[PDB]
Structures are given as structure tokens and as C-alpha cells.
Amino acid sequence: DSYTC
Amino acid sequence: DSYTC
Amino acid sequence: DSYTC
Amino acid sequence: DSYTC
Amino acid sequence: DSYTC
Amino acid sequence: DSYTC
Amino acid sequence: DSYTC
Amino acid sequence: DSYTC
Amino acid sequence: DSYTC
Amino acid sequence: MYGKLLICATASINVININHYIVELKQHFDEVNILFSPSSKNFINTDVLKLFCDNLYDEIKDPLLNNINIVENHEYILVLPASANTINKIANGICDNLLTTVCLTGYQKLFIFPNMNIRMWGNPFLQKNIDLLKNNDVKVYSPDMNKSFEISSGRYKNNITMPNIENVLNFVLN
Amino acid sequence: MYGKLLICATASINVININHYIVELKQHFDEVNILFSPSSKNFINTDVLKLFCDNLYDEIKDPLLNNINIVENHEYILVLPASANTINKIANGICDNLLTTVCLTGYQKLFIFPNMNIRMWGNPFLQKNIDLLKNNDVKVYSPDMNKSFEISSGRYKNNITMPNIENVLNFVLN
Amino acid sequence: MYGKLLICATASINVININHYIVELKQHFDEVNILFSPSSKNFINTDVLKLFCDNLYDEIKDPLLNNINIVENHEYILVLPASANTINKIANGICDNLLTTVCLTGYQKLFIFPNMNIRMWGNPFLQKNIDLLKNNDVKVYSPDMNKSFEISSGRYKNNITMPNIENVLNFVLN
Amino acid sequence: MYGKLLICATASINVININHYIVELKQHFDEVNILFSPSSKNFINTDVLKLFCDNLYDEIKDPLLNNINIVENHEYILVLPASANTINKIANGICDNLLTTVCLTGYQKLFIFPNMNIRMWGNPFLQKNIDLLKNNDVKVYSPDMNKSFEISSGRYKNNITMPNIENVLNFVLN
Amino acid sequence: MYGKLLICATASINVININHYIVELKQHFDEVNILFSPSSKNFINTDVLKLFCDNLYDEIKDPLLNNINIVENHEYILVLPASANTINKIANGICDNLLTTVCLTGYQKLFIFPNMNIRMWGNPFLQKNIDLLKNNDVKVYSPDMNKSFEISSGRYKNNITMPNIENVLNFVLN
Amino acid sequence: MYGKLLICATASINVININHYIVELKQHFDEVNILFSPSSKNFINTDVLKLFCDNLYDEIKDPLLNNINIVENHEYILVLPASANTINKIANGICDNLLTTVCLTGYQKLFIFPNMNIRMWGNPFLQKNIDLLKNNDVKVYSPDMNKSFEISSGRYKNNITMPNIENVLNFVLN
Amino acid sequence: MYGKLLICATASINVININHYIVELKQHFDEVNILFSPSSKNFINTDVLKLFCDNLYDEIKDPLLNNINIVENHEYILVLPASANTINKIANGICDNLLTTVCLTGYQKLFIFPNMNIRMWGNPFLQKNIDLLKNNDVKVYSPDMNKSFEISSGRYKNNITMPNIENVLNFVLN
Amino acid sequence: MYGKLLICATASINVININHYIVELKQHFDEVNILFSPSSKNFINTDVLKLFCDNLYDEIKDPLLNNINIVENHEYILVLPASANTINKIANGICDNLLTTVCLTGYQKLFIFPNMNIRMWGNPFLQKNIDLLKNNDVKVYSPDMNKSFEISSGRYKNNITMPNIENVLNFVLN
Amino acid sequence: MYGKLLICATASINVININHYIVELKQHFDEVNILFSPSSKNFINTDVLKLFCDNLYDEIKDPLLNNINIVENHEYILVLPASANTINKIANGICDNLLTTVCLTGYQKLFIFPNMNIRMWGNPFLQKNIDLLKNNDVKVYSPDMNKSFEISSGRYKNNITMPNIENVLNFVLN
Numbered sequence A, B, C, D, E, F, G, H, I: 001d002s003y004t005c
Numbered sequence J, K, L, M, N, O, P, Q, R: 001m002y003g004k005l006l007i008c009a010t011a012s013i014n015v016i017n018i019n020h021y022i023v024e025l026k027q028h029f030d031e032v033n034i035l036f037s038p039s040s041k042n043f044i045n046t047d048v049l050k051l052f053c054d055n056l057y058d059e060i061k062d063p064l065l066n067n068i069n070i071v072e073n074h075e076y077i078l079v080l081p082a083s084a085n086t087i088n089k090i091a092n093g094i095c096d097n098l099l100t101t102v103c104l105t106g107y108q109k110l111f112i113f114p115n116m117n118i119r120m121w122g123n124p125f126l127q128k129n130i131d132l133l134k135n136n137d138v139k140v141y142s143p144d145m146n147k148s149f150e151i152s153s154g155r156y157k158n159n160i161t162m163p164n165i166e167n168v169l170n171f172v173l174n
């Protein structure tokens, strides 16, 4: 699972 | 210019 | 109970 | 007052 | 000897 | 006299 | 038992 | 004036 | 170059 | 339930039982907050009082606490226990720590409960300051005399004792 | 250009603008040196003032600074801003830090510019000390009243304000 | 009252007077928050600014501050005073501290107010970056020239000066 | 099994999952070593990676690590995740930490995998640097767009996402 | 041999020669113990005095020293050298350190030997406190005038000097 | 004897022999002062250079060193050895430490002597910056090629070498 | 007024009264400077001596003090009080601290004043070294015997005593 | 039971078994106290010996331990194990730590038990000092040769061995 | 290529150029390892030498380094530069640090290269020790006289100089 601010 | 609590 | 030196 | 080195 | 500022 | 990694 | 370097 | 152990 | 105090 | 109340606790051996007062007073005032003198931290872990009082003012955690806000936020300010040192600093307008600064700012809502050895109580300079405080509308409670446990000799001699809650309430509310 | 002047800055919120005074005063006095109270270091990095004043007296860098030399090296000593605490310490001859020690030693060249909330200004004990200071030839400027920025609300209101340079100069030189 | 505004203060000698701007701007923007470059902490105690601004972003107190949230929370981001270093870092997309990271993320709401010696201002590389910034829609104010108190010699000479509030407001709002 | 590979991990929120990549890549390269940027240490305990990679280069444990040896010891150098800051530093030849120094020295074996918010991705300066990197034979992967968990709003919006292993392998080996 | 004697040494430049007094007094009193003000520790290593006096009271080593016990354990308490600061604190009942707390508690056995520059000696506030002390039965010795080695200039001038042992003994025992 | 000269030493393995240059140059310039990059302190104890150069500028000892004064106090400023990092920072106008700040301010008196592995020297980005520096009147010496001690193997090989004094003098004075 | 004199003070209990000698000697020598052995710092705060001597050489403040310069700057070098340890180190040419290094370099201007218990004085090895020192032109004063304060008992007894100033002067000048 | 005995233990690998000696000797001497060289603390936790010996002299816990009292309090002083370094320091009268100071003061009650590699034992300088010690009435035991475990090669070769208790007792008491 | 060689470097100002020797000697000996005296660490960052020598023995990193192993691992042990202090300690068998302990253990493979001011060189005690060393088969090189850059004054005068490599090799191998 990728994250982003 | 002047400060107070 | 109160204390004293 | 503004300042400069 | 005694001293003073 | 000269050095290199 | 004695030791030595 | 002088001290010793 | 060599140095001395 | 009356207005918010602030306890200014100083370095008296009795500060170790300040929690009993916080709990009692919390039954009569909307809020009971506390502020300690730097030296009283040698007697207790002030952190634990966060579990009993609404707010703990810590000048080390926050060196820029607004003394004006603190005074305005309370209707009553109690110096309990009040040490000879703090009493004398207040009387001379000395405020070199947050507690004394708050007491200078809130002299109009100040209630002082002295606690110390009867011998200290007899100090001339202390007494002149107590008169000066009273003559300038700062409420100073008259220490109670009774059986006190003297840590020095382990004897239960007669000496100045801490005020019971009824007397605290009556002195503050009346 | 008058003689060397020393600024004794105390822990008033206004100490953060002390640089404006240093620069202004440097246009009228051979030297403008500065000395801070321990507590004022919580408001500003005193190190930066070395870039504006001729000399910075730091009791931490040098715990053995000669207060007699400091007093003899200046023709004028200003407590600006002067806190209620320092004013009261000076009035009682208390000198437990370099700043107050310098003020006790140089009472004859002392000029005090009070700065604090009007509520603190009304303290009875503070006022008795101010009279005592004046009655003993210590020059105490009368605080100006005007519009001020209240940090708690971020809005402007009437209260004690800092003295402008004309008034400082006139109070010190006349 | 306009939207929330963020001040990104850098290590210019003039950062010591950043409080004057905070107070002024607080009269026109819902919120005025501040964020300092690591180096500016050598000029002032940033802690005191908590008393003037709504929020102080401290990357040391909290190393995991979300730059995206910070940028989204403001309508205007001002680099004031803006150092040559930060201007050049922004121009090259370099963001090795929170301040520059915020500036990279919020380039669209960025307003830069340069402050430095005229000699530094003449640097070729700095100027190429200023053109690059302008040609990419980053608002860069043109430094004002006037009497500036040079710290090298206590003499008022002509050099780049800080922008007055009218100019700041006009540059940001128009 | 291909030659030794080095991962240069930077301060992207996704660095917390760098272990998944190490394990995957270890199935295809003789060695998988890692090197972190100083800031990424605020996101993870880099020490634990010693349990997955063959070697961990720590510039704090050893400030005199030979960047030339590091570059010569590997056939592939991946900046993953690659932050906007590191990408821009590499493009400008800035190398003020071990990671960027290694990237300058090994530009010929460099593979960059950008990761950041789409908003940051749109920065003009960042984009000019990405072109400069590509036009100078530094391999820069084109960020994938897809469902990403946005820590800011807790929503699964569309944004730049981390590259899956197939794409990493294909970009590096082809 | 008289009873136990306590020396309360304060931050006067002459505290560096306090050992001469300890040794002398030890020839006349069962015990000679010492207690220093926090500031005097900047002038001497108080630890060495443990080799001359019977007991050294250290409030840092033990923050909970019972001032009542200390006062009860001695027949005489000497403030020597007595600084202007400590004299003024005692006069106002201020006791924010162990030394002054002991002096407040034992005012009845207190003997004060002032030492300071003649200029400090002339301070109005100091003098009012000295009168107050005397008018309340606190024994204050009248400073001797004589050749004193002024540290400002390596020249022997006339100023306040330390009391010789005969005078100390006579003032304390008579 | 020519004017005052400043050496800006960076983190090249060769900085360990910077003393040889100081002594040599001191035979031709009124003063030879030195300023180090933060990273070079990992290679040598910069304190010892105080024994050879006239002045050592230490941004840690004094964080408020005036870069304008430093630049004005010298006729020549040499970056020797000049690292790829510092060269690239100067080219982009980046000045996040005292050394680079001095180089931005004194670009007109700047003489750069590159030192690094031939492989680093081939970096595209480094080379574009070197052209940019030269095209903007910053003097950049062309690295000499010759026999060198390779620390990894302990044997000699052909690579970039440090400039001898004749070449330094000729490049700076002609 | 004779030439500059240096006092090399060692860890003898009597080092606590070294100030009396500095003041006395300052009446006969242009300068009286002092240098302490590392161990003597456990007996006194050497910092305070800065108020009496012209210069204080501190190897901790400055680890790179030039012993040759120190020796050349003085016409006389006194080891006072001289401990058995330092005497024996000098005799064997051992110089593992600044004081002993100065004594080895300036053996030709060395004057040693032994101070220690008579029992230590009888040590065979110490005595052989004292003969060796004398037979090699190092001036070693013969310890005086007289009444002394014994720290263990607090009573006076016959033992080695410190030299009075007349004897010091006569031994050094004749 | 004989008089009080003091063990002066030095940094020999065998100091790790000093507890066996303490227990044995405690069966024959009123008291067995111990004193360690600074370096021996790298071999053992000296604190644990407080559980076996009557008193532990720690120069770090108390830097002002009276060596004269220590020597007077014992009838026998053993250097066991005695290192080459301490033996040589004693022979030259060097006493730069408490242990060697005690040995210089108590040379008349000194019993030395050498322990070291046979190779070290052959050192010319060591041997000259051992003769000097013996020729001046300092009792030096002749090292025993036997099977010793050599930590270097893990072999049980022949070398100098520690003295058994019978030999220690006989050498000290006879 | 001869056997393994160990350099024992001491606190001579010339220790700052010890790297030149390491590199040279590495061309003739299988291994060149180094060991510093505690004091020499005030002149250089010993850590960097790890890049030139095969092994760096650090008694702080490892307080339990086996001196016997160190001596057995080398065919030659050079004290270079050799300070007066270390020379004298070796001569007296004093070994209170790893370097001197190694020299005592390996006296048979010891080669000493003295370096110090000619004035120190003239010390009687130093010279007696040098004779003692030579008369006991410890190889002591005779210092060379020549143009030496005196640090006291930036002038080249005649004094003791460091040995060139040819002389070092010839003295050690012949």
C-alpha cells in the first residue's frame, strides 16, 4: 500500500 | 510597538 | 496529620 | 529601524 | 591580607 | 603528497 | 589459576 | 598558616 | 616542512 | 460550587499532603489548579498532581506562562502551605519565580495560610511583613496551634498545624 | 556624545525589542553596554545584542565580573525595561544576580523605566518600594499610558507602554 | 480579515524584528503562523514568538510535521526576511529543512521578500535564480533601497532595507 | 542473480516499507545494500534493516566511508523512494551527505524512483531538474498514478504511488 | 572551648580565605561547621573545607537538610563574610536558599560581619536594613576600615577590611 | 607581501595537509586566515591550525560571524581543497554554512582549486556548474593529473592531484 | 620590580592559600602568572586566581599552549607549593602535563619549594631525586620546620611548613 | 590476627581474582582494605569488593582522601598484583594517583608482588628499578614461575604466576 | 617488503604530518600500524589515519588491547615523533598508557626518533635517560639539525628537524 501526505 | 500580557 | 521540622 | 551587515 | 573590589 | 579515494 | 597476556 | 595531612 | 615550538 | 481556585504551594514539609486539599476543594470550586515554587519539587513529584487538579502550571515545561492570564482565570488564589520565605517575598513585592509573580499580580484575590515551626514564626522580620500584608488587604490566616508530629525529634509536641478544610473554606468564602 | 551608558534589561515581554533602544542610544552615548537578568534569557538570544552594543556583560560566561568596575565604567545606568521584581529587589537592597548587584552599587547613577501590566503596577508593595526609591534619590520614570498590543487577545488596548527615545533621553539627561 | 497567513523566516539579521510584522499582519489576517529556518535560531529565541503568532511550527519539537497540511492550511506564504540562501534553494527545488520543503510544496502561494547586503544582492547566481523564480510565477518583491543601519560601522548608509507593512500588504493582496 | 545493488533511501513517508523492497530485490541481486539520508532516520529505525540487507552504510557510525568504494562495489544504484529534495540535489550536483555524494559519484549507475505528493510533483523547479537529469543519462522512472492512502485526510484518493517490483526490475534491468 | 559554632559564608571576594577563620575558631569552639551560599561556590571549591571544619552542610548533596536541626545544633551562627545581598535578605526575612533559611530560623544566635566595598556600604537601602537588624536584636559588627588590597588596581588603599580573630571572638563572646 | 588571504578549506581527503599550504602562503601574504566547512572537521582537528594561520574563523565558537566583514578583510579568497559539493553549492548560490556564505559574498575575489576523484570530476552536473562559474568570472583552476596515493589500495596511481605552491601563486597573482 | 615570574602550583593542601603569595609577589615582579597541575583543581577554583595574577595558563581552556613561549616569557619559574610527585617527575624528566612540561623546558630558571608531610619527605626515592636536581643546577629550597595545623586532628604540631615571603624572595633573588 | 592490612591492586589481568586474596587474608588480619589504580577499573567492577573488604578507598568518590591517614591506619601495605608501571613509578617516587601516593608515603610498610609477562619482566629499566627498590628497603617478592594460562594463545605455558597465600603470608610476616 | 611495522606517535607538533610517514613506510613494510599517546589527540583527528594505515590501535575504543599481542605482531616499533616525555617514561620503565606499555614490552624492537625544541633537548635529565636507553640496546636516532619553521615567529631558524624517510629506513633496517 502506497502512501501520500 | 508596546506589548502587555 | 500536620508536620513540623 | 532596518539593518544590514 | 584583606581584599576589596 | 596527494591522496584520492 | 594465574593468568598471563 | 601552614597545613599538613 | 619540519616544525619546532 | 464557587469560581475557579488556584493553589500556590510552597516548600513546607506539609506540601507532601497537598493532594488531600486538592480533592477536598474540588468538591466546592469549579476548578482547582495548582502552581508550585521551584523548591517544593524537592519534596514531591509535582507531576502526579495532574491526576487530581484540573491544571498544573509548570514554569519549567513552559517558561513563558502569562501570569496575567493565570490571575484573571481565578477568583481565589491560595498560598497553601505558605512558607516564611514566600510570605516575605510577597510582602516585599519580590517575584523571582512564577508563583511569587502570580501572587504580586493577584494580591487582591490572595489568601495566605502560613505553615512553619513556631520558632520561625517568631522571626521579627517575618512578623513585620505579616502586618504589612494585613494592613494592605492581603488576607493572612492566623496559624492554628495543636498536636503536630515533629520530624526532628519524632515527638508529638504542640506547634503550628495545617488548617482543616472547614477553616480554609470559611476563611476564603467569608 | 555623552558618557558611557549601561542598560540593565529585565524580563519584561518588551525586552525583545531592546535592540531598537541600543541603536538609538548609540547615537548619543560614547558607549552603550548591556547586562541582562537571568530570566530575560527566556525571551531573547542575548548573544545577538553583541552586534549592536559595545559590550555585553554575561555572568554565566564570566561569574567573576567586578560589579564595582562595571559601575565605575559608566556615567548612566538604565533599568530598561524595569520589571516589578527587579524594581522591588533594588528597593530592598536585594542583589542575588549581577544586574541587581550592579544596581545596588550604582544607585547614584540609576534611572528606572517601569514596564508591566497596569494591574501589576497597582500592587501596594510595589508602590511603597517606588516611593522609597524616589525618596532616596533613585530616578524612577513615570510609566506612560497608551495603546498596546495584548498578547493574549492579539488586539490593542490602553495600558502601560514603553518610553519613546525622546523621553528616555530627557529623563536621563535632564 | 483575509485568510490564514504563514511567515517563513530565515537567517537574516532582520529576523530579530520579525515580531513587529507578526503583530501588524495579525490585524489583517485570520491567523499569522510562523516557521523558522534552523539557522535563524542563532539570532532569536523562537519560543517567544508563540506569544504573538497563532501557531509556531517547530521541526525539532516535531520532526514529522506534514508539509502538505501546512501548505493547505494557508492562503499566503511569505518568506520574510528571505535570505540569499533560501531564495537560491527554493529556485533549485532544494528542500533539506521544513521551511524550504514548505516553500517547494506551496510555490503557488509563495511571496518572497529579499533582505541582504547590496553586495550579496549583486551575486550573479542569486540573480539568475531570482529571474527563474519570477519566470515561474513565484512572486519576488523588489528590495527597497534606503537608510539602513550598517552593523559593520555604527553609521546609517544606503543599502537594501526591510519592506514596510503597506508594501508587504499591497504586494501580497494585489 | 545480477550484480550487487545499492538502495539509496530518502525521507519519503514510504521509506517505512523499504523492507519489502529489500527482501524482494534480494531474490534477484547478489547483494542488496542500503544507505539512508539523514532525515529518513526520523521515520524508521534504520538499524533493523541490517537484518534484511547485506550491508548498511551508516555515515554516523563511520563518518569516513569511501564513496568511491561504495560506488565501485555496485552495478546498480537506486534512489528509492526518491524525495523531491534529493532529486533536486542530485540534479544540481549538491552532495552534502553520504547518500548524495554517492549519487554524484555514481551518476552512471543511477536509477531514480520519485515519490511525493502530486502537488510537489508539479513544482516547476523540480521538473526542470528532472529534465536535466534525463538529458544527462540519469535514469528517472515515471511515477505511477493510482489509489494511494493519503495520511492527511485518511482518504484513498488518486496520487503518485510506489513502483511495484516488476516495474522496478524492468526499469533497472532493461 | 565554647559551644558548637556555624559559619554562614557568602559570596564576598574574601570567602577565599575562609579557611584561616575555620582553623582559628577551631581553637576555641567544640565544633566549627560551615554552610555556603550558592554563589560563593564560584569563588572556591567548598569541598576542600571538609578537611578543616567538622561538618559541611551542602544543600545540593542533600536538598532536604533540616534547618531547625542545624540551628539547634549550634550556640553561635556567624555570617562571615556577610554580603550586602545576604544582609538585606535576612533583614527582609527572605530565605530562598539554605543559608538564609538558617539565618531566619536562628536570628537569636546570629552574628553578622559585613564585608563589601565602601561604596556598596553606603547604599541607603542596605543601611536601613542594618538598622532594622540591630533594632531587632541581631548582632551586626561594625566594619573595620584599613589598608585593603583593591583588586581593581593592584594598590593598597583604604576600605572596609575583614575582622581579625580577636575582634570576631570578642564580638561573639561578649 | 601581498594583501590578506583567506583559505576556505572543504572536506577533501587532502584537507589533512592544509597546514603545508598555510605555511607556504604565509611567506607571500600579509595574513593567511582559514575557514572550514562543517564536514572537514571529521578529517582534522581544526584547532591546531590556529598555530599556523593568523586567524581561524569558527562558526560554532561564534555563530554570528559577519560574512561581509570577512570578505572585506581579504583581497583573495581560495577554496582549497575545493570539493565537488562546495563547488556546486557556490555555482547555485547555495550558502547554508559560513564557508559558502563567504563564497557567495566574495565571488569577485574567489579562486577555486578542485580536488576529487577523476570519476567524480566527470559528473555532468558538476561540469555544467564549473562552466557556469567560469562564465561568470569566478576563477576555477584546472585540476592537475599525476601520481597519487589511493587510500583503498595503498598504492600509487594516476588521478587528480593537489596544486603545488608555484601554480597556486601564479593562478592567484596572475 | 624584577622580571616576569611564573608560579607552578601543585596539589599540596597548601595550594588553597596560593593567593597570599600572588599578592605579595606582585609587589616585586612586573608580572606574576600562574599555572596549576591537573590535580590541584580538586583543592581550589583556579578561576578566581585570574583576579590576582596577570595571566592564568589553563591547559584545558587551551590544550595547545606553547611551553617554549611560556618559559621565554618569564625570568623566574617557581614550583610553589611543590609536591613530592611533581618534584620526582621533574627529576626524571617526566612531563605529562603542561606544568611539568614547562618545568622541563625551563629547568634553568627553576626554583622549587617542597611542601609535604615530614614522613613523605623521608622517602628514599624522593631524596635521591632532590640530590639529582641540586647536582644539576635546579634550585631546591630546604623545607622549613615549624608549627603546623594537622587537618586530621585539628591541632598544631611540628612539621614542614610553607616558606614566608622574605625567604622566597631571598632564595629566588640571591 | 595481625594488624590492619591494605591491598594496593594494579592493572594486571590477575586483578580479576583479587577477591580470593581478600577473603584469605581476612582470616589473618584485623582488617583488609583495598585501593585500586585508575586503570584496574577497566578489568573489574571495584564496587563489588566492598562486600569482601572492610574498606574500599575510592579517589573518584572522594578526591581528598588523606594518604597520611591511610598509611598510618595500616601495618602492612601490599601492592598485589603489582604491575610493571606501578613498580617503576614507586621506584622513581612518582605518585600521580592515590595508590602511588600511598606507596610513596608508606614505603616503610611496602610489600611488592610483581605480576606480568616474563617478557616484560626482562625489561632493563624495570630491573634497575627493582634493584633500587630492594637496595632501599622496599620488600619486593621474587615472582614465581609455573604453569600459567596465556590468554594470548590459550596455551598453558610456563610464565610468571601469582603467589599463593602461604608465600604471601610468609613474605609479609617474616 | 619487510615485516609489519608499528608507529608509536606522541604529542610533538610534528605529529600533524604523521600521514606522510605512513604513506612512505607503506611502500616498504607489509603493514604499517599506528598507536597514539592520549595527548597527541589534541593535535589531530586520529580517526582519519585509519584511511592510511592498516590498523589503528585505540585504547579508548578498546581499553583491553593486549600489549603482548601488539608487540608480537610487529618486527619494528618506531616512536615517531618521540616526545621528551615519552622518551623519559620509556627510560624509567613508566607505562601509564598503551603506547608506553607497548614500548616497555617491546624494548627489543624499539627505534626512537626524538623531536623537540633544541632547548628541551638540552635538558640534563632527558640526556641521562637517552644515555641509559642507548646503553641498554634501545636504538635512539640522533636528531637532525636544520631549517625548521619555528611556530613562535613565522621565521625559519635552525633547530631539531624531523628525519627524512631515507634516514628512517636506514636507521631501522641497518
Ligand SMILES: Cc1cc2nc3c(=O)[nH]c(=O)nc-3n(C[C@H](O)[C@H](O)[C@H](O)COP(=O)(O)O)c2cc1C
Residues within 6 Å of the ligand: C004, C005, J009, J010, J011, J012, J013, J014, J037, J038, J039, J040, J082, J083, J084, J085, J086, J115, J116, J117, J120, N063, N064, N065, N066, N067, N095, N096, N097, N098, N101
Ligand atoms: C525538610 C524541610 C522542611 C521544611 N519545612 C518548612 C516549613 O514548614 N515552613 C517553611 O516556611 N519552610 C520550611 N522549610 C524551608 C523552606 O523549604 C525554604 O525556606 C525554601 O527556600 C522556601 O522556598 P519557597 O518559598 O520557594 O517554597 C523546610 C525545609 C526542608 C528541607
Ligand SMILES: Cc1cc2nc3c(=O)[nH]c(=O)nc-3n(C[C@H](O)[C@H](O)[C@H](O)COP(=O)(O)O)c2cc1C
Residues within 6 Å of the ligand: B004, B005, J063, J064, J065, J066, J067, J095, J096, J097, J098, J101, K009, K010, K011, K012, K013, K014, K037, K038, K039, K040, K082, K083, K084, K085, K086, K087, K115, K116, K117, K120, L051
Ligand atoms: C511572557 C511574559 C511576559 C512578562 N512581562 C512582564 C512585564 O512586562 N513586566 C514585569 O514586571 N514582569 C513581567 N513578567 C514577569 C517576570 O518575567 C517575572 O516577574 C520575573 O521573575 C522577573 O525577573 P527579573 O526581575 O530577573 O527580570 C512576564 C512574564 C512572562 C512569562
Ligand SMILES: Cc1cc2nc3c(=O)[nH]c(=O)nc-3n(C[C@H](O)[C@H](O)[C@H](O)COP(=O)(O)O)c2cc1C
Residues within 6 Å of the ligand: D004, D005, K051, L009, L010, L011, L012, L013, L014, L037, L038, L039, L040, L082, L083, L084, L085, L086, L115, L116, L117, L120, O063, O064, O065, O066, O067, O095, O096, O097, O098, O101
Ligand atoms: C550576523 C549575521 C547576519 C546575516 N545577515 C544576513 C542577511 O541580511 N541576509 C542573508 O541573506 N544572509 C545573512 N547572513 C548569512 C546567513 O545567515 C547564512 O547564509 C545562512 O546559512 C542562511 O540560512 P537560512 O537560509 O537557513 O536562513 C547573516 C549571517 C550572520 C551571522
Ligand SMILES: Cc1cc2nc3c(=O)[nH]c(=O)nc-3n(C[C@H](O)[C@H](O)[C@H](O)COP(=O)(O)O)c2cc1C
Residues within 6 Å of the ligand: A004, A005, L063, L064, L065, L066, L067, L095, L096, L097, L098, L101, M009, M010, M011, M012, M013, M014, M037, M038, M039, M040, M082, M083, M084, M085, M086, M115, M116, M117, M120
Ligand atoms: C510525514 C512526512 C512525509 C513526507 N513525505 C514525503 C514524500 O513522500 N516525498 C518527498 O519528496 N518528501 C516528503 N517529505 C518531506 C521530506 O522528508 C523533506 O523534504 C526532507 O528534507 C528530504 O530530505 P532527504 O532528501 O535527505 O530525504 C515528508 C515529510 C514528512 C514529515
Ligand SMILES: Cc1cc2nc3c(=O)[nH]c(=O)nc-3n(C[C@H](O)[C@H](O)[C@H](O)COP(=O)(O)O)c2cc1C
Residues within 6 Å of the ligand: E004, E005, K063, K064, K065, K066, K067, K095, K096, K097, K098, K101, N009, N010, N011, N012, N013, N014, N037, N038, N039, N040, N082, N083, N084, N085, N086, N115, N116, N117, N120, P051
Ligand atoms: C569577584 C567578585 C567579588 C565580590 N565581592 C563582594 C564583596 O566583597 N561583598 C559583597 O557584598 N558582594 C560582593 N560581590 C557581589 C556578590 O557576589 C553578589 O551580590 C551575590 O549575588 C551575593 O550572593 P550571596 O548573598 O548568595 O553570597 C562580588 C562579586 C564578584 C564577582
Ligand SMILES: Cc1cc2nc3c(=O)[nH]c(=O)nc-3n(C[C@H](O)[C@H](O)[C@H](O)COP(=O)(O)O)c2cc1C
Residues within 6 Å of the ligand: F004, F005, M063, M064, M065, M066, M067, M095, M096, M097, M098, M101, O009, O010, O011, O012, O013, O014, O037, O038, O039, O040, O082, O083, O084, O085, O086, O087, O115, O116, O117, O120, R051
Ligand atoms: C575519506 C573521504 C574522502 C573524501 N574526499 C573527497 C575529495 O577529495 N573531494 C570531494 O569533492 N569530496 C570528497 N569526499 C566527499 C565529501 O566529503 C562530501 O561530498 C562532503 O559532503 C563535502 O562537504 P563540504 O563541501 O562541506 O566540504 C570525501 C569523503 C570521505 C569520507
Ligand SMILES: Cc1cc2nc3c(=O)[nH]c(=O)nc-3n(C[C@H](O)[C@H](O)[C@H](O)COP(=O)(O)O)c2cc1C
Residues within 6 Å of the ligand: H004, H005, N051, P009, P010, P011, P012, P013, P014, P037, P038, P039, P040, P082, P083, P084, P085, P086, P087, P115, P116, P117, P120, Q063, Q064, Q065, Q066, Q067, Q095, Q096, Q097, Q098, Q101
Ligand atoms: C587533602 C590532600 C592533601 C595533600 N597534601 C600534599 C602535600 O602537602 N604535599 C604533597 O606532595 N602531596 C600532597 N598530597 C598528595 C598529592 O595531591 C598527590 O601526590 C598528587 O598526585 C600530586 O599531583 P601533582 O604533582 O599533579 O600536584 C595531598 C593529597 C590530598 C588529597
Ligand SMILES: Cc1cc2nc3c(=O)[nH]c(=O)nc-3n(C[C@H](O)[C@H](O)[C@H](O)COP(=O)(O)O)c2cc1C
Residues within 6 Å of the ligand: G004, G005, Q009, Q010, Q011, Q012, Q013, Q014, Q037, Q038, Q039, Q040, Q082, Q083, Q084, Q085, Q086, Q115, Q116, Q117, Q120, R063, R064, R065, R066, R067, R095, R096, R097, R098, R101
Ligand atoms: C588485558 C590486559 C592485561 C594486562 N596484564 C598486565 C600484567 O599482568 N602486568 C602488568 O604489569 N601490566 C599488564 N597490563 C598493562 C597494564 O594494565 C598497563 O601498563 C597500565 O598502564 C598499568 O597501570 P597501573 O599501574 O595504574 O595499574 C595489561 C593490560 C591489559 C589490557
Ligand SMILES: Cc1cc2nc3c(=O)[nH]c(=O)nc-3n(C[C@H](O)[C@H](O)[C@H](O)COP(=O)(O)O)c2cc1C
Residues within 6 Å of the ligand: I004, I005, O051, P063, P064, P065, P066, P067, P095, P096, P097, P098, P101, R009, R010, R011, R012, R013, R014, R037, R038, R039, R040, R082, R083, R084, R085, R086, R115, R116, R117, R120
Ligand atoms: C603546540 C605544542 C607543541 C609541542 N611540541 C612538542 C615537541 O615538538 N616535542 C615534545 O617533546 N613536546 C612537545 N610539546 C609538549 C608535549 O605535548 C607534552 O610534553 C606532552 O605531555 C607529551 O605527552 P606524550 O608523551 O603522551 O605525547 C608540545 C606541546 C604543545 C601544546
